[PDB]
Design a protein around this ligand. Structure first.
Ligand SMILES: C[As](C)(=O)[O-]
Ligand SMILES: [Ca+2]
Length: 304
């Protein structure tokens, strides 16, 4: 497959030139790497019908998902208490991220990271440059952990372990959280716990600030302020000047988003506060962040 590709040889040339790898051994690795046809079909898929909150929320706030989230919390309560004390990130949020990303380990990943990132970085032009950056960080992270690169698994796009970190997030955020010398986000829940918290804190999480606020609108023209995407463009003072009223009497000066969900029992208006934006840094989706925030609430409810 990648035995003698020109681009593969030019990737190995940059690896031995900017990061000091041994080209010969590096090209012995790529001889054992498989091009995954199923990955190409997956990422070649076109626009997939986005779901209404009415249908999206019940997929992730299920009795099974919550129940297993309390078990996960019970089992690692001491590491979660440690992560929340050191990083200022709520424990229910950490559990909820892991429960949403992998269902607490049930869906860690079906492909070898080396296959996924190679297939993409060398056989998918639209984002090849991106997935060759991740391939590079992955070879770097496999060297740092002294693990062998073919033993690591992940999603079709190369997200790894319980928190589904892509290689670059692994190198920049993952932490050795039980003091044993390794960073094992695949099967060491302690490192998963600490790694998610390090991610959130380093993406701007403010400890003690609320995440979301229920909102009302004075007029249907205020729906023109619904945020297209997850990037805020106004302060809360702006949005309120547009006809949005938050039940919470929160300060004006802060960047917010405005959301209109078609919920279980009618239209739902939400204002996403900065911390809510930190959740979307994990996956650029308004419904994702809402499912994570509410799931963390259900699990904290059921745990007591
Ligand atoms: C896909 As990620 C949580 O490493 O940005
Ligand atoms: Ca560790």
């Amino acid at each position: 497959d990648y035995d003698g590709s020109p681009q593969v040889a030019e990737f190995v040339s940059e690896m031995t030139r900017d990061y000091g790898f041994a080209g010969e051994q590096l090209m012995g690795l790529f001889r054992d790497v498989n091009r995954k046809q199923s990955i190409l079909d997956a990422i070649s898929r076109p626009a997939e019908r986005v779901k209404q909150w009415k249908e999206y929320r019940p997929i992730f706030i299920s009795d099974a998902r919550i129940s297993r989230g309390v078990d996960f919390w019970n089992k690692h309560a001491e590491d979660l208490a440690r992560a929340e004390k050191e990083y200022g990130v709520p424990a229910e949020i950490i559990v909820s991220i892991i429960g949403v990303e992998t269902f607490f380990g049930r869906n860690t990943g079906s492909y070898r990271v080396m296959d996924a990132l190679s297939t993409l970085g060398f056989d998918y032009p639209p984002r090849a440059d991106f997935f060759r950056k991740e391939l590079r960080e992955f070879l770097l992270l496999a060297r740092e952990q002294q693990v062998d690169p073919l033993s690591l698994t992940g999603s079709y796009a190369g997200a790894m372990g319980l928190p589904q970190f892509m290689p670059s997030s692994f190198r920049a955020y993952a932490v050795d959280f039980d003091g044993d010398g390794h960073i094992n986000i695949w099967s060491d829940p302690t490192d998963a716990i600490g790694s998610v918290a390090s991610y959130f804190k380093q993406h701007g999480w403010v400890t003690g600030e609320p995440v979301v606020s229920v909102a009302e609108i004075n007029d249907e023209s205020a729906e023109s302020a619904v945020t297209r995407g997850v990037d805020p463009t106004m302060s809360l003072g702006e949005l309120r000047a547009r006809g949005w009223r938050t039940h919470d009497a929160l300060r004006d000066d802060q960047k917010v988003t405005a959301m209109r969900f078609v919920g279980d029992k009618g239209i739902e208006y939400w204002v996403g506060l900065p911390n809510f934006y930190v959740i979307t840094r994990y996956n650029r989706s308004a419904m994702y962040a809402m499912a994570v925030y509410q799931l963390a609430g259900e699990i904290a409810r059921a745990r007591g």
